[PDB]
Amino acid sequence: MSEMITRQQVTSGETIHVRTDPTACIGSHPNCRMFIDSLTIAGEKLDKNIVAIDGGEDVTKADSATAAASVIRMSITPGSINPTISITLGVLIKSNVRTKIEEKVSSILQASATDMKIKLGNSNKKQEYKTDEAWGIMIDLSNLELYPISAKAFSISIEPTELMGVSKDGMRYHIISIDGLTTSQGSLPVCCAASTDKGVAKIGYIA
């Protein structure tokens, strides 16, 4: 049982939870990490400016940016109709961009809440080093579109950190924590203990 997602959770329909270290997406280490190559929030496209490192990747060969955001935590509680989801993303942005994203989200959220979309790009394939000595995914988040259950259930915070220092162009690693989201996607690909433990987690209604 070292696996972030257990076969028991997937078979039973229990809450699925993933969590990595905040800067797991960078550096040379054997721990799990998740990141996505694009991210749009309330229509604002985040720049792909993080040189994120896929599992097992040789960091000395890493040069161009590979990620618009890291996924630091995610919680999905399956629902009969729609799931309830919270997510924590790490982005590299300037202070002025933080304020503009917050304002844009609030504006859409107050106008018509379900129109505020968060669209994730392709997630990395080597997220967790499995028990059979090969890398595999924890959850494939590629192309997932999330939106608020309602304005009242929704919460968002964007906080600056010194985790990646201050880039030469003034950007800091910020942590975006979002709660009260759901999605119309009915399932997600997952992988449990070993690389051969692939499955599909049903999370909601499939028409």
Automatic annotation (TrEMBL):
Pfam families per the UniProt record, alphabetical: IglC
Protein name listed in UniProt: Intracellular growth locus, subunit C
Organism encoding this protein: Francisella tularensis subsp. tularensis (strain SCHU S4 / Schu 4)
Gene encoding the protein: iglC2
